[PDB]
Amino acid sequence: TLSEYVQDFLNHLTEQPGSFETEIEQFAETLNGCVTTDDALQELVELIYQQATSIPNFSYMGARLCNYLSHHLTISPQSGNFRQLLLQRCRTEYEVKDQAAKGDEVTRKRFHAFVLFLGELYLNLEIKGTNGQVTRADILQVGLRELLNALFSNPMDDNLICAVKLLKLTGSVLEDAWKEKGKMDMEEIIQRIENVVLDANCSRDVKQMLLKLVELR
């Protein structure tokens, strides 16, 4: 089945991160021969999306794999390409982020995996722009800002640690994009972080991590 093939390959990348470069072409090639329906494309997207948002430490690999397949799969069905379906799928979970940042620490591990997968996707998913230049996904730029708002609004240590990671990852790229468009988001994020540090009952070391970000941005 497609799902056995894909899941085997994802397990393989998880166990052997080094094998991406030498096995990715064969993976794309095999998928090109077998992913021929809108349905099969949708299922491929779902399997990779699940691995990236479950499975710890699959953020970077997930996003790198997503970008690769978005450029190397030849199927372009009427209803959406890989890129397009992925981005749609991300909006689905992103819609429940206000609730996802509550719950309990174990349930939130999946939310954090989703947040960082989206951060890595934003950095690494290359889209040919309207002017033919490489651009980043807009819906991800917007989603990241809202995810940060959700994480700071529920200032439990593990939520704050997730926000710190996401901003170390994407913060300079975000800062640049907001400034090109004369937006004040980084200022607003900085005030949110300062209010956490002033008010929240989180750990001292997490507060100190937040303060280091205020120096840099």
**Residue 134 dihedral angles phi and psi, to the nearest 5°:** -60, 135
Cα 162 to its chain centre, rounded Å, is 12
CATH number, position 63: 1.25.40.180
Three-class SS of 7-71: HHHHHHHHHCHHHHHHHHHHHHHHHHHHCCCHHHHHHHHHHHHHHHHCCCCCHHHHHHHHHHHHH
Give the separation between CA 28 and CA 83, rounded to whole angstroms: 15
- Identity (one letter) of the amino acid at 189? I
**Residue ranges making up the domain that contains 169:** 1-217
Task: Read off the tokens for 138.
Answer: 């807009």
How many independent structural domains does the chain possess? Answer: 1
**Residue 78 dihedral angles phi and psi, to the nearest 5°:** -55, -35
| Experimental approach | X-ray
- Identity (one letter) of the amino acid at 94? Y
E strands, 76-190, where? 127-128, 134-135
Give the separation between CA 117 and CA 52, rounded to whole angstroms: 6
Give the separation between CA 121 and CA 114, rounded to whole angstroms: 10
Residue 129 CB neighbour total at 10 angstroms:
10
CA atoms within 13 A on the CB side of 107: 7
Cβ–Cβ under 8 Å, residues 62 and 52:
yes
